[PDB]
Short mmCIF file of C-alpha atoms and ligand atoms in Angstrom, two decimals:
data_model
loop_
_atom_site.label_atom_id
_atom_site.label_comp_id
_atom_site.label_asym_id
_atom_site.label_seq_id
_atom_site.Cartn_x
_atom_site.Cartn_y
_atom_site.Cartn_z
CA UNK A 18 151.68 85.35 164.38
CA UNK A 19 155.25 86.41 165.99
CA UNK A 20 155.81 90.08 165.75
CA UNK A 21 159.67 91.22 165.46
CA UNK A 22 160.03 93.56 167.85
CA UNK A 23 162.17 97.01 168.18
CA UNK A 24 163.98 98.31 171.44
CA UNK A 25 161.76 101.40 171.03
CA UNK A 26 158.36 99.47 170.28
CA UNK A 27 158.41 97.88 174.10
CA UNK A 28 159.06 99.66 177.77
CA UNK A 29 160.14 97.47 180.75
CA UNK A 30 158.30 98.96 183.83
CA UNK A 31 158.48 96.67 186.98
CA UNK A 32 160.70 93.31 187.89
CA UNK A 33 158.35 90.85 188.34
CA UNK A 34 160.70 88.17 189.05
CA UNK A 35 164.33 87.17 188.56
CA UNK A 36 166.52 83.95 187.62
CA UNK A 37 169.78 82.80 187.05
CA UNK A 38 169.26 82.79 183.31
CA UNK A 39 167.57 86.08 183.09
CA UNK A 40 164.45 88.50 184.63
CA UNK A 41 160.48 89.27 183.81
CA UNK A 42 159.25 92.85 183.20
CA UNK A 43 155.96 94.40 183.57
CA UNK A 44 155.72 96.30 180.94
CA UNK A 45 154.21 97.88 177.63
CA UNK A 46 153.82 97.23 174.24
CA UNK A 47 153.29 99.83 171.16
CA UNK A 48 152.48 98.26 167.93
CA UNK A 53 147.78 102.57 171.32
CA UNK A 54 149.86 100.79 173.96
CA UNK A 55 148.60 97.59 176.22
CA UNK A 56 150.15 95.88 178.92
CA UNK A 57 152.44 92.63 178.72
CA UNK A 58 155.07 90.70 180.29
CA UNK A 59 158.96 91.20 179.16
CA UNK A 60 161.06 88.10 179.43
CA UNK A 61 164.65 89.37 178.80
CA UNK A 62 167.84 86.85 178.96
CA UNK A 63 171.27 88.00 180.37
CA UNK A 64 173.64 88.04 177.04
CA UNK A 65 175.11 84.81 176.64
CA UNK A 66 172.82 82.31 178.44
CA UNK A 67 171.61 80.62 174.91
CA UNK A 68 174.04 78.10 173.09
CA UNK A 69 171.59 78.80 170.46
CA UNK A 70 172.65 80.96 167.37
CA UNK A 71 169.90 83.71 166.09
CA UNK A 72 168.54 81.70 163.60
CA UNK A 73 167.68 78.58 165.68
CA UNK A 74 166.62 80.66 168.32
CA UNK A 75 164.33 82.44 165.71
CA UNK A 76 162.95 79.17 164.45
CA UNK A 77 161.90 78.12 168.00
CA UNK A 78 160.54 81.50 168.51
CA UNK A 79 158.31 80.76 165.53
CA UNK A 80 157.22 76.87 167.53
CA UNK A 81 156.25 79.01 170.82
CA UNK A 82 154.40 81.40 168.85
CA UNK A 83 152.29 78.55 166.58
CA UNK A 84 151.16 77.52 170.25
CA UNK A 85 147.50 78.01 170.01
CA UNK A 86 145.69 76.13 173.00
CA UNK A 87 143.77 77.79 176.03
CA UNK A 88 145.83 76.43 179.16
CA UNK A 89 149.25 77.11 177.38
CA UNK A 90 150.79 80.97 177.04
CA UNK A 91 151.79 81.91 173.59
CA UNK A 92 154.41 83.56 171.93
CA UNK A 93 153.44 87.49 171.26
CA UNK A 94 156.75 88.75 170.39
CA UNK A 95 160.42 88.59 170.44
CA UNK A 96 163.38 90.92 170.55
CA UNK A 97 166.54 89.75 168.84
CA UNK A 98 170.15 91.66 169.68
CA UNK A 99 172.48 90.43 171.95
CA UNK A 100 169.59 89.58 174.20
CA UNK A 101 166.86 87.52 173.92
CA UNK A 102 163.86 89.55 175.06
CA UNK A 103 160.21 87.50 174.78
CA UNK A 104 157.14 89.53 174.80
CA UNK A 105 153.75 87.15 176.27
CA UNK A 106 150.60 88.70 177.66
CA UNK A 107 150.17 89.84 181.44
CA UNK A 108 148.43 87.48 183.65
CA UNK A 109 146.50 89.68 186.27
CA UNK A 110 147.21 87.11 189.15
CA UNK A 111 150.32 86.04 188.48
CA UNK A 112 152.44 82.61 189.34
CA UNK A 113 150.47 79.76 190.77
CA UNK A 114 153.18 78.70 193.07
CA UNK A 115 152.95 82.25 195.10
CA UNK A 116 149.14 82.39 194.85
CA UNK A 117 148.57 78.93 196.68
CA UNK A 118 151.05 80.10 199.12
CA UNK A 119 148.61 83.72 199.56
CA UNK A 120 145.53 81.50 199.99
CA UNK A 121 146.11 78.48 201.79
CA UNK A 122 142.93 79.20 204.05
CA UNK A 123 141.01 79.97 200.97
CA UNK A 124 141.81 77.85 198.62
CA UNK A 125 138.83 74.47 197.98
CA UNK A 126 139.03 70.88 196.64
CA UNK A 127 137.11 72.05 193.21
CA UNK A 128 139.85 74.70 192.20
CA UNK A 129 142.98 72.60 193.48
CA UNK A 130 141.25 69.82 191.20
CA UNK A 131 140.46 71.83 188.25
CA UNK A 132 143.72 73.35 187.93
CA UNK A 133 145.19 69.66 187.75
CA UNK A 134 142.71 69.09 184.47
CA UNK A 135 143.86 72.02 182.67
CA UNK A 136 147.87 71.35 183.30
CA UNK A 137 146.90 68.12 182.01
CA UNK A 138 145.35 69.70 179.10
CA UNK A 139 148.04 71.72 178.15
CA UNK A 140 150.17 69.24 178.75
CA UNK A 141 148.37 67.00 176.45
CA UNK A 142 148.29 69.65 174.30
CA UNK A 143 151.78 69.25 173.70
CA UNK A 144 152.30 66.16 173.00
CA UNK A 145 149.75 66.29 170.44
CA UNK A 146 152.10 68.71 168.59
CA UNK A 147 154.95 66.37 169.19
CA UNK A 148 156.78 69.22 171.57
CA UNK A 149 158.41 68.89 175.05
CA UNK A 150 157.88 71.23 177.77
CA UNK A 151 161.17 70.05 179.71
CA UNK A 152 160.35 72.61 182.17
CA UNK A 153 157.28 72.02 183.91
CA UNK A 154 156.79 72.99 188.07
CA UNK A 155 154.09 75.37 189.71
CA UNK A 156 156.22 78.06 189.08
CA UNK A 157 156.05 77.91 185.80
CA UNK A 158 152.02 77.77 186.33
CA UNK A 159 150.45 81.36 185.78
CA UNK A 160 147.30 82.22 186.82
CA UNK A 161 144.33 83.81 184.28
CA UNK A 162 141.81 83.42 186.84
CA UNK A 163 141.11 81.36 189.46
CA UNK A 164 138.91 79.34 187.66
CA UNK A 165 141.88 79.68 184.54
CA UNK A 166 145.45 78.69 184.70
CA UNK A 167 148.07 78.72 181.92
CA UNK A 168 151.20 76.67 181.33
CA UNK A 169 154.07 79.33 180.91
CA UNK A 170 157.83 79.16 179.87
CA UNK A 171 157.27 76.78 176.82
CA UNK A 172 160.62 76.51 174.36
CA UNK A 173 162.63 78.45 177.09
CA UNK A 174 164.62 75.06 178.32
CA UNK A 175 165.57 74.13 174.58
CA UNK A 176 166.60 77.94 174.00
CA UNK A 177 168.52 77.77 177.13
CA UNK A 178 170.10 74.85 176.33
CA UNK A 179 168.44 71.89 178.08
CA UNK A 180 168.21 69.11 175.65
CA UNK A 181 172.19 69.13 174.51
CA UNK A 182 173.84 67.10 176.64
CA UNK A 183 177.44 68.20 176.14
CA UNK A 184 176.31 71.96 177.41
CA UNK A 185 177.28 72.86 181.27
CA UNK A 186 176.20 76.09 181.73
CA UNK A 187 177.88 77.86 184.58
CA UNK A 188 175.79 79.40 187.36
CA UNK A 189 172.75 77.60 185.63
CA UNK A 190 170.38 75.87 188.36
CA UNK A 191 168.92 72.90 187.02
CA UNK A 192 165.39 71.77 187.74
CA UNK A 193 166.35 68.42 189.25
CA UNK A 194 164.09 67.98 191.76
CA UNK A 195 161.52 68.39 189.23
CA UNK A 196 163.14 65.62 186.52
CA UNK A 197 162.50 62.51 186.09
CA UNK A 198 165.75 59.93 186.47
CA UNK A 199 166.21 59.66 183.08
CA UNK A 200 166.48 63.21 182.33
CA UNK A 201 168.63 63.63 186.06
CA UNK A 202 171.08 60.66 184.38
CA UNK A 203 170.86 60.51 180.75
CA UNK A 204 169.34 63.95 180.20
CA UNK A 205 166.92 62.47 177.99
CA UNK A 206 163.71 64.47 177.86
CA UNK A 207 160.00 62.94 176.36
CA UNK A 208 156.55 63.23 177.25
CA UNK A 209 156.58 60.59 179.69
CA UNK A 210 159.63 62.91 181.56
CA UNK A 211 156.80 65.39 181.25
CA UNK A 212 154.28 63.53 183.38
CA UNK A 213 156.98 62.68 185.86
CA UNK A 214 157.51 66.47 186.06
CA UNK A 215 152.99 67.30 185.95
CA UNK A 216 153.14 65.14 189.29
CA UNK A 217 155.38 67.13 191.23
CA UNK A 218 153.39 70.47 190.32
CA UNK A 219 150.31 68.42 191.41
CA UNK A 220 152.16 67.78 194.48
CA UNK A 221 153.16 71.28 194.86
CA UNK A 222 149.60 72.39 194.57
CA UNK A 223 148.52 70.12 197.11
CA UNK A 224 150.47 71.06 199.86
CA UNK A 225 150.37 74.80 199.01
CA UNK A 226 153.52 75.32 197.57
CA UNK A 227 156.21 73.95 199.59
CA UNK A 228 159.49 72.91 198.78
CA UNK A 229 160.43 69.29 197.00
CA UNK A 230 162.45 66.99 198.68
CA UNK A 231 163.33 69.83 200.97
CA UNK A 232 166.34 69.58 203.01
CA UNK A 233 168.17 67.40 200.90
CA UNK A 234 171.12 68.67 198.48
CA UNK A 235 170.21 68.34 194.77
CA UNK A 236 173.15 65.92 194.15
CA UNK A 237 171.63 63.20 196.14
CA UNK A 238 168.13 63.64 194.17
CA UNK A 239 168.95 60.39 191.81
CA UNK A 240 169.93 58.15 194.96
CA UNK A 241 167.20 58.43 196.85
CA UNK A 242 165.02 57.75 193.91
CA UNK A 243 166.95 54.77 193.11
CA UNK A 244 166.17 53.42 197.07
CA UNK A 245 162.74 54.34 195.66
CA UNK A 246 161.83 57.67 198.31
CA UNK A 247 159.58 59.80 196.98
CA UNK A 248 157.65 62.73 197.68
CA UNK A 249 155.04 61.81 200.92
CA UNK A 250 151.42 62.21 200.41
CA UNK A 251 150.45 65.53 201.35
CA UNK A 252 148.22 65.92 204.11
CA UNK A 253 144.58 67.11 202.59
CA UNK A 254 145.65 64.24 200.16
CA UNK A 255 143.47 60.66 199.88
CA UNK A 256 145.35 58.26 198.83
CA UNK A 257 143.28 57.90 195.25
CA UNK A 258 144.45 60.96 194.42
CA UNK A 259 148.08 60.08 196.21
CA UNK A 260 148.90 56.72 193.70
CA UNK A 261 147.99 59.04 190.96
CA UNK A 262 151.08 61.13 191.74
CA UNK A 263 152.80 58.15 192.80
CA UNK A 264 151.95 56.31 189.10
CA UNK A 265 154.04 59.43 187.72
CA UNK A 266 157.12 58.80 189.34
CA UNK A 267 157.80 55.33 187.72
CA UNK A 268 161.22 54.51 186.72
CA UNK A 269 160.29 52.91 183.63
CA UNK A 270 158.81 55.74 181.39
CA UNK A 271 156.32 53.48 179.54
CA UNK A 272 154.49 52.59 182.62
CA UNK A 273 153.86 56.13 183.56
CA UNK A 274 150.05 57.35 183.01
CA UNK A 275 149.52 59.75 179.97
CA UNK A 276 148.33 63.15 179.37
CA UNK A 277 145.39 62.25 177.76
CA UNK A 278 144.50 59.47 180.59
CA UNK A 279 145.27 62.06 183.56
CA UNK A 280 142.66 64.26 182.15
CA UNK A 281 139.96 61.55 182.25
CA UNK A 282 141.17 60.43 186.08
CA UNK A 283 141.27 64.48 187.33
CA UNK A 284 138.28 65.50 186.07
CA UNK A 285 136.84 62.53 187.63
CA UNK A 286 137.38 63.30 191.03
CA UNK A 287 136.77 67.12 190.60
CA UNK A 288 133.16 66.18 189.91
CA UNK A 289 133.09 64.92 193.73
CA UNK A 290 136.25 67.16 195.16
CA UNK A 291 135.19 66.35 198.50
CA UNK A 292 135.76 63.05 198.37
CA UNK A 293 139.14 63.05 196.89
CA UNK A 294 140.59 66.00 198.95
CA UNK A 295 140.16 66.76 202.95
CA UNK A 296 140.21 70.61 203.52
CA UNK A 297 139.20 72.27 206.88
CA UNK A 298 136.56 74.97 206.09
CA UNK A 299 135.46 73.71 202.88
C1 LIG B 1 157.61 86.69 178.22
C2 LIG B 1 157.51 86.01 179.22
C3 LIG B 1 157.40 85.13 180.46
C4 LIG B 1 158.00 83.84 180.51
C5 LIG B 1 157.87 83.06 181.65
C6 LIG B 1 157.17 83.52 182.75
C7 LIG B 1 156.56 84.80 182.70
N1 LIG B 1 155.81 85.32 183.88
C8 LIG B 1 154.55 86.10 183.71
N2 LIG B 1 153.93 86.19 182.48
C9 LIG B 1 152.80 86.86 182.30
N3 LIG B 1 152.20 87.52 183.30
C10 LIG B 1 152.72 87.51 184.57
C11 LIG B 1 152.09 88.20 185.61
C12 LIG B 1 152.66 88.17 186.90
O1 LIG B 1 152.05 88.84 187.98
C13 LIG B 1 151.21 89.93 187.85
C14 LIG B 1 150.80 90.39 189.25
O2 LIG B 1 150.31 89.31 189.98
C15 LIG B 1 150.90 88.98 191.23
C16 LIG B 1 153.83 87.46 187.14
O3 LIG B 1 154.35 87.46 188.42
C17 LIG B 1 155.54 86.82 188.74
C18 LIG B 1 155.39 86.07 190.07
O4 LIG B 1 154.53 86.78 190.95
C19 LIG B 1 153.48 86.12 191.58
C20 LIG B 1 154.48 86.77 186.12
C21 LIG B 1 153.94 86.79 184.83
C22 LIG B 1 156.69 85.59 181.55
#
């Protein structure tokens, strides 16, 4: 269930990491004390009034699926502060940047699957990630990785069109170009999003459509550029990625079908991914 937290029930140790619409603690939570992660949001940053923010406090926290993070807590005052637990290895973005050298077909593959799942996941419950990138990707285990940040782009705004927040970054490089131009978000947005994670994974965590300014994202996808296929990438795996960037949303594979094509291939990783030492 979702436990309403006190100030004094919680202790923010470390910065893991930091945004433009807030920072995560490593910290500690007293109901004997164990160890979580502290999402707090700079006063503010939410167009959301308590209530609303409460009620999709209580979606996050329903979440109940192995490759997606759930809602432990929450901490309502003039910030919002979101209690989840601590994932010993952290972001999956930074960790395939740590192991390029070490890092094999079967777990690049794998991890694909389980997004997917989680992703399907999702949709199953009718609910919209709008926020999905390697970043947002923690890592259980190698063998395990989670789907974090659920709920956080609705409570920060996303889906209302009339909002501008100021000094907010959107992820537009990560949208698809009906979310860039109409800001509508579904779960065929969603997949568009899953296959630039994928594409993240595969060439170890560099940068989207690097080099080019965020306004021009939307042109260049109109002339129809996309992201190139990553080297260790065969080109089965390649249109995959490729069928996710679609402009018409319909067309787009789904959740449910990307699981059956990924776990495909990582029954025979080899053959759908060229790594040197592997
Ligand atoms: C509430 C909440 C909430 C909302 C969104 C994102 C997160 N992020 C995380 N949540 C849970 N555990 C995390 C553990 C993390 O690392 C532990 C040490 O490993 C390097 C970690 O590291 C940040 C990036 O570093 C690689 C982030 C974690 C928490």
């Amino acid at each position: 269930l979702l436990r309403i937290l006190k100030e004094t029930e919680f202790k923010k140790i470390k910065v893991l990491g930091s945004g433009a619409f807030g920072t995560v603690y490593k910290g500690l939570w007293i109901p004997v004390k164990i160890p979580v992660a502290i999402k707090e949001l700079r006063e503010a940053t939410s167009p959301k009034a308590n209530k609303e923010i409460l009620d999709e406090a209580y979606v996050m926290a329903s979440v109940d699926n192995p490759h997606v993070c759930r809602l432990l807590g929450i901490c309502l005052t003039s910030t919002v502060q979101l209690i989840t637990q601590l994932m010993p290895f952290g972001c999956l973005l930074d960790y395939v940047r740590e192991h390029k050298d070490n890092i094999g077909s079967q777990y690049l593959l794998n991890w694909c699957v389980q997004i997917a799942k989680g992703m399907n996941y999702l949709e199953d419950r009718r609910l919209v990630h709008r926020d999905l990138a390697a970043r947002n990707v923690l890592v259980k285990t190698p063998q395990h990785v989670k789907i974090t940040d659920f709920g956080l782009a609705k409570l920060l705004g996303a889906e209302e069109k009339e909002y501008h927040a100021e000094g907010g970054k959107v992820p537009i490089k990560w949208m698809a170009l009906e979310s860039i131009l109409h800001r509508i978000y579904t779960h065929q947005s969603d997949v568009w999003s899953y296959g630039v994670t994928v594409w993240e994974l595969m060439t170890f965590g560099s940068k989207p459509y690097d080099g080019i300014p965020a306004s021009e994202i939307s042109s260049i996808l109109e002339k129809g550029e996309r992201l190139p296929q990553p080297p260790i990438c065969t080109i089965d795996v390649y249109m995959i990625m490729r069928k996710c960037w679609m402009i018409d949303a319909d067309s787009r594979p789904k959740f449910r079908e990307l699981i059956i094509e990924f776990s495909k291939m990582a029954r025979d990783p080899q053959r759908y991914l060229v790594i040197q030492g592997d």
